[PDB]
């Protein structure tokens, strides 16, 4: 988005820290081109005198202003996608009770017991549990108060800027391209999923190419369902975005909120409002307090769903801005935030769609970086969706999500202290699809030290997961 003012005022929100990711026995064997993100601007592994603060907020290239005709076109696409969205999800999007906002309904998970509470609770030294009874289902003093100022449109807040402690490619580590989380006040998170909770729960339960959303999916079992759908089509695309979150223009954001979350579709009048507050945000980064117009905080509730909805409207917007009489059945797509797989029997030129995405402020490149030219003919077994490649299993005949061996080496090479064993179990579920031999090599440094699930114990489990009959029939 557009940074309207940089200001150093009063307080200093300490976000500087050391990584708790420690190298494992795997790191010495594999030596990945991967390492923990730079969480302090004085990291020795940083490139020549490059300031970490400088790069972090440099994603804000501005707020792209759309013309009255581009706005009217985006509105039509937003109304058309929302028509499809609410036709298959229903209009049971009534406000979620204080209880259901905490505990979560069927589809929507419970709110996190104790994560970062946001502001001004961090400038007070207290937890999520010190504000809300997560065991009960209701809140505390200031939260039921904040509930009512949100109810009365009065509420104003500030986003707390966190540093993402994660493994990243060493090039991005050296460049200091550490990703950031914008932790919003816990009452905002609570009230957002009060307004759009049942909708988000419906989104998860109905995930698939029909709604154009992979949010709520189980890649272990849903890869078979997704893989067969996209195999039918002539051309498949692997689209890539440059800072997808920060580049959502205020015009596109406001219109989407106006068209999808209408009171006509069963939403509370404050469903449109609470999401509109995400347009113009205040960011607390240590001594700095920066106001940002446009883009969306990467860490709010339903952040993956909002970006999915936007990604769906973008593709429809761009195609209609180029081709004649483009409808929703002209193509098919599934998206998770910025991750996206497009398919059509038509030979669509995505090399020509570049500037039509630039009218939104988004830059589309092919994920397959080769010559960076959107080529035709690509199949389902070419794309990378959710870091997972689509592969036909030679044993059962079903699609399986395979991660690149270099990526799986990176996950295993770094882990927080005293978590190795549980992470080895968790990553083993991801690594089982790479084959019996690769599974052996990936876990070779861990033998005699930790419990490694036998390749067969995870394969036989996976077969029962994809189809309950598939294991019984064999």
């Amino acid at each position: 988005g557009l940074i309207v003012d940089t200001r150093d005022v009063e307080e200093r929100v300490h976000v500087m820290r050391k990584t708790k990711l420690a190298p494992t026995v795997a790191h010495g064997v594999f030596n990945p081109e991967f390492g923990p993100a730079a969480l302090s601007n004085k990291d020795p592994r940083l490139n020549e005198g490059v300031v970490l603060d400088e790069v972090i907020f440099s994603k804000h290239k501005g707020d792209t202003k759309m013309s009255a005709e581009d706005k009217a076109l985006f509105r039509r696409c937003a109304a058309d996608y929302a028509s499809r969205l609410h036709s298959v999800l229903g209009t049971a999007n009534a406000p979620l009770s204080i209880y259901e906002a905490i505990k979560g309904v069927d589809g929507l998970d419970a709110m996190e017991p104790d994560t970062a509470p946001g502001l001004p609770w961090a400038l007070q030294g207290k937890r999520r549990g010190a504000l809300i009874d997560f065991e009960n289902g209701t809140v505390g003093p200031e939260v039921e108060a904040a509930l009512k100022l949100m109810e009365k449109r009065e509420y104003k807040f500030a986003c707390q800027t966190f540093l993402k402690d994660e493994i990243r490619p060493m090039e991005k580590v050296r460049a200091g391209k550490t990703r950031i989380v914008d932790v919003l006040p816990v009452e905002h998170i609570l009230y957002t999923r009060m307004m759009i909770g049942r909708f988000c729960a419906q989104m998860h339960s109905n995930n698939g190419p029909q709604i154009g959303s992979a949010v709520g999916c189980n890649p272990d079992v849903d890869w078979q369902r997704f893989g067969t759908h996209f195999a039918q089509y002539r051309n498949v695309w692997d689209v890539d975005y440059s800072a997808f979150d920060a580049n959502h223009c205020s015009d596109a954001m406001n219109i989407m909120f106006e068209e999808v979350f209408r009171t006509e579709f069963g939403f509370h009048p404050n469903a449109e409002w609470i999401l509109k507050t995400l347009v113009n945000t205040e960011h607390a980064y240590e001594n700095k307090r920066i106001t940002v117009e446009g883009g969306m905080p990467s860490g709010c509730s339903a952040t993956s769903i909002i970006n999915t909805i936007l990604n769906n409207i973008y593709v429809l917007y761009a195609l209609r801005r180029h081709y004649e009489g483009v409808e929703l059945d002209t193509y098919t797509m599934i998206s998770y935030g910025d991750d996206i797989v497009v398919a059509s029997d038509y030979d669509l030129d995505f090399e020509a769609l570049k500037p039509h995405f630039k009218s939104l402020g988004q830059t589309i490149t092919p994920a397959d970086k080769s010559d960076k030219g959107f080529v035709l003919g690509h199949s389902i077994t070419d794309v990378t969706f959710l870091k997972r490649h689509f592969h036909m299993d030679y044993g059962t005949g079903f699609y399986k999500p395979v991660m690149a061996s270099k990526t799986l080496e990176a996950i295993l090479s770094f882990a927080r202290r005293g978590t190795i064993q549980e992470k080895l179990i968790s990553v083993a579920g991801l690594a089982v699809h790479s084959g019996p031999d690769e599974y052996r090599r990936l876990f070779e440094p861990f033998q005699g030290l930790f419990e490694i699930p036998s390749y067969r114990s995870l394969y036989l489990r996976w077969v029962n997961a994809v189809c309950g009959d598939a294991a019984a029939l064999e």
Binding site: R179, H204, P219, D240, A243, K369, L386, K387
Partner: peptide, 15 residues
């Protein structure tokens, strides 16, 4: 590779 990184996130967590 642009901003799109190879190893970071799958999903949010388990359903």
């Amino acid at each position: 590779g642009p901003y799109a990184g190879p190893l970071e996130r799958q999903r949010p967590l388990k359903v």
